[PDB]
């Protein structure tokens, strides 16, 4: 990477000003005479002791044990930016009450307790407590900074780029103290460890959506997306901070009886922060989800395997890749078309030589029951023969410069303009452009990839747009930067919905993202490299996205840059097989690495990884349904399941899928084995390949070969699988289920299963779905409804039950409503204590119970 292209904090004038303020006595003071306790909020004036600037603090208690702090100028010259469209609703407030008062202090109670907020007047300070336990302090180190709008702090240059900065210094900043917290997580995206590092001896973590060519590992440089959410975990509690600001933001983290301090510094906008008080991390998940929404339920096919590269050259190449999967017995749902499929990178078009008949290509793919993804970027070639550019120019929908002309930068088609996606009129235009009459050559099995939406501008400062470009409503680009990509993602997803009459669920991959991006589809970690350390870092990077609500995450399988050695590609397939978004992708200058081009031993190990992923699709689908309804991450750090095991607080070579599967992919060339930490007091874990049972807590040395994927099922869980692997997920979605029951030491287990048609909103608009609960206790396995509202016509039935940790029964008896009592044959392996129940034959929609005698 070329670091000189990207500002350090010292080269960012507002970061330099803010960071030079060091912990000390704050000059800010609350004027308790101005205190007003309102219907929704408490409002009280603040004053800078030296400058006499007057600010308004708006303090709110919120339902679900959250607090919102907003600070703005009392009499501003012009309005400051408040982030729109990220919050799904106006958060329901709780009533505040003055329950104590001093000459320098006011104590507030949220509703009837137990949460209390202590406002200190001089110096300004806020403390949040549960009863009398101190949870969090605000401005405890006096780092609050609010540059009021006055009449490199003004005109500023970086390299050759000039920022006219017509409003001067307007940055805002605030610090937070977390007593008892030593481990913090989140604020993606950074190619760094899951547990965030202290920033004292170096750079703060930067949040600014940037296109970083050949980015490197273990550093705090800003990458393509920015989610200003930080989680703090201890043995005792979990907390979250949500800094709702869309401008360039730097985050300092400092340690100190143990206590972590957090400081946010943003270039403009107001101070708008949510404090999510837990106490458990799943409470924090719920609290954040109520604010910014939940993961959009992916259409089933998008959880299969995606085959991509830059570029498949023509229709014949696409069809040859499609046929190669079938000729080599490898499942695949989607083939991707990168930017060379269009006419000279004019998006929504097709190359007239290499893609002359897109409808026919899509028809051949539909006949294989596969899908296609086409890339559509938000930069529009300046070209009077290009209808998209002409309509956007004639309707004034482009981002503009200060002189009123449309902004023009450089990107893939050369000189390009940038639609103002912050303008709702532009988003409605963009959405309508995806209709089958407007996007000629598209079809219902074509989905979309949004790339370069930071936005990437090849000739712009830090390879993005000028700070003083002007958007809808007069706002500057510095005000809105980090939600530009989100708006592209949003407008694309809405277009795929509307083109179907509102019936089909969308699938959109996006590179840039913000808080709330989980509502619109998937993201990925951008342009990684075919190297073993990039394979390793895909876990903490996607783990950091999962913790802040973006569950549909992945990394380019095999690495984007360079050519992976066959052993590395095998390990990346095994790694990607157990990560949410599962796509192989590659740079223009790489060798072809479709999986059947390798020697047979590597092919076989890759095929085995693909088969495992496809068999687990009912499990992945259910985890994503739970994410969609509750806001719980699919891919989880071990400390989410074991909040009191302090030895898991930093683990990032292991992860869990839901609460049932623990994964430790091999991530070293020539490895002879791995060290697998199996946590949990009185917990047992089953090696899903050997069925060998293991008690926790322990660090197990597991020998591995090329085809090994170290995966363990937790006792007390039930995992559903489609053991009939077919060529795509559409082919499998009516097939029978096999249930894998891992018995706890108490002989119990539980699990869920979600089913629907696989691709429409009928689950929500018509309640056409099934949510089953499977529970085992004593010697009886019972299927019941976990949501009675859900009904679905489906041929899916239970063809097999595999029970781990069971003794040989004397007889097996099946009972279901509407049927006589039935007897089942079975197989029992005394060495492994594995019980296989043959062909139960019961509908998945029916209540039933199996009894082992």
């Amino acid at each position: 990477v070329d670091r000189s292209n990207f500002k350090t904090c010292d080269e960012s004038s507002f970061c330099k000003r803010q960071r030079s303020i060091r912990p000390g006595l704050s000059p800010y003071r609350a004027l308790l005479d101005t205190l007003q306790l309102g219907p929704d909020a408490l409002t009280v004036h603040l004053i800078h002791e030296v400058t006499k600037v007057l600010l308004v603090l708006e303090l709110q208690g919120l339902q679900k044990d959250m607090t919102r702090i907003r600070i703005d100028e009392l009499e501003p010259r012009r309005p400051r930016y408040r982030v729109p469209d990220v919050l799904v609703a106006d958060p329901p407030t709780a009533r505040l009450s003055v329950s104590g008062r001093d000459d320098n202090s006011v104590e507030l109670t949220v509703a009837e307790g137990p949460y209390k907020i202590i406002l200190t007047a001089q110096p300004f300070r806020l403390d949040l407590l549960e009863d009398r336990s101190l949870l969090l302090s605000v401005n405890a180190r006096g780092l609050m900074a609010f540059e009021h709008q006055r009449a490199g702090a003004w005109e500023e240059t970086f390299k050759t780029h000039s920022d006219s900065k017509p409003y001067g210094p307007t940055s805002v900043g605030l610090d937070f103290s977390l007593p008892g917290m030593e481990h913090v997580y989140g604020i993606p995206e950074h190619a760094d460890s899951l547990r965030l590092k202290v920033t004292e001896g170096g750079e703060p973590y930067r949040l600014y959506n940037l296109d970083v060519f050949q980015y490197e590992l273990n550093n705090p440089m800003a990458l393509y997306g920015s989610v200003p959410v930080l989680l703090a975990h201890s043995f005792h509690r979990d907390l979250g901070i949500f800094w709702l600001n869309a401008a360039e933001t730097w985050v300092d983290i400092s340690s100190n009886t143990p206590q972590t301090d957090i400081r946010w510094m943003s270039e403009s906008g107001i101070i708008d922060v949510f404090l999510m008080l837990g106490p458990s991390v799943f409470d924090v998940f719920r609290q954040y989800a109520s604010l910014t929404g939940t993961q959009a339920l992916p259409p089933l096919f998008s959880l299969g395997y995606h085959q991509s590269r830059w570029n498949y050259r023509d229709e014949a190449d696409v069809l040859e890749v499609d046929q190669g999967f079938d000729d080599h017995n490898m499942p695949c749902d989607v083939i991707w078309l990168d930017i060379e499929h269009a006419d000279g990178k004019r998006y929504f078009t097709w190359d007239p030589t290499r893609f002359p008949q897109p409808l026919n290509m899509l028809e051949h793919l539909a006949s294989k029951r596969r899908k296609l993804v086409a890339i559509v970027d938000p930069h529009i070639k300046v070209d009077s023969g290009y209808r998209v550019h002409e309509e956007l120019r004639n309707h004034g929908l482009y981002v503009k410069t200060r002189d009123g002309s449309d902004y023009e930068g450089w990107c893939w088609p050369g000189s390009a303009s940038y639609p103002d996606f912050t303008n709702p009129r532009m988003r409605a235009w963009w959405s309508n452009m995806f209709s089958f009459d407007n996007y000629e050559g598209s079809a219902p099995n074509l989905y979309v990839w949004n790339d370069m939406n930071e936005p990437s501008v090849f000739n712009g400062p830090e390879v993005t747009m000028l700070k003083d470009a002007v958007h809808y409503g007069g706002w500057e680009h510095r005000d809105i930067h980090n939600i530009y990509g989100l708006y592209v993602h949003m407008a694309t997803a809405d277009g795929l919905i509307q083109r179907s009459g509102g019936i089909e669920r969308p699938f959109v991959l996006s590179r840039a993202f913000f808080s709330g991006s989980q509502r619109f589809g998937a993201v990925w970690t951008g342009d990684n490299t075919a190297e073993w350390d990039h394979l390793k870092i895909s876990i903490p990077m996607c783990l950091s996205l999962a913790l802040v609500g973006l569950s549909f995450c992945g990394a380019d399988v095999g690495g984007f840059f360079k050519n992976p050695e066959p052993e590395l590609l095998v390990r990346w397939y095994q790694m990607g097989a157990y990560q949410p978004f599962f796509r192989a992708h590659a740079h223009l200058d790489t060798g072809r690495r479709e999986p059947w081009l390798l020697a047979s031993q590597y092919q076989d190990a890759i095929r085995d990884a693909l088969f495992q992923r496809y068999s687990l699709l009912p499990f992945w689908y259910t985890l994503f349904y739970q994410a969609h309804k509750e806001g719980f991450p699919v891919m989880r750090p071990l400390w989410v399941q074991y909040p009191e095991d302090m030895s898991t607080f930093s683990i990032e070579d292991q992860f869990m899928l839901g609460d049932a599967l623990l994964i430790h992919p091999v991530s070293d060339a020539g490895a002879h084995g791995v060290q697998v930490y199996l946590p949990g007091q009185e917990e047992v874990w089953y090696d899903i390949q050997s069925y060998q049972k293991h008690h926790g807590p322990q660090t197990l040395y597991l020998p591995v070969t090329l085809s090994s994927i170290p995966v363990f099922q937790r006792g007390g869980t039930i995992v559903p699988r489609w053991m009939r692997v077919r060529r795509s997920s559409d082919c499998m979605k009516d097939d029978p289920i096999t249930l894998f029951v891992a018995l706890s030491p108490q002989g119990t287990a539980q699990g869920e299963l979600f089913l629907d048609d696989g691709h429409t909103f009928n689950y929500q608009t018509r309640h056409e779905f099934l949510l089953r609960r499977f529970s085992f206790s004593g010697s009886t396995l019972v299927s019941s409804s976990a949501d009675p509202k859900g009904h679905l016509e489906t041929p899916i039935w239970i063809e097999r039950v595999v029970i781990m940790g069971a003794g040989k029964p004397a007889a097996v008896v099946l009972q279901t409503k509407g049927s006589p009592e039935s007897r089942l044959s079975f197989q029992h392996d005394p060495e492994t204590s594995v019980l296989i129940l043959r062909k139960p034959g019961v509908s998945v929609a029916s209540d039933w119970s199996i009894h082992l005698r």
Binding site: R369, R724, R726, R727, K839
Partner: protein
Amino acid sequence: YEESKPFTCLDGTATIPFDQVNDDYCDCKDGSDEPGTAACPNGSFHCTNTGYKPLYILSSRVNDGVCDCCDGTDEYNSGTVCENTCR
């Protein structure tokens, strides 16, 4: 009266009752008990292809919604109606 006999997997191994042939559950380790279903992972389905050359396909491609045999007989209960194209 006199009854009838059972089925033995072509790999020796085991012998199953005759009602477990093509009962949509895999009982033979070689897949030989399900020549007409998608139940076995290692089974094969025979396209007679009476108007052309016969063909074997994977059991996983029986009733997958995709036309694999030119005579269309691999899709008999999938919702995909395959036309005869052996010509």
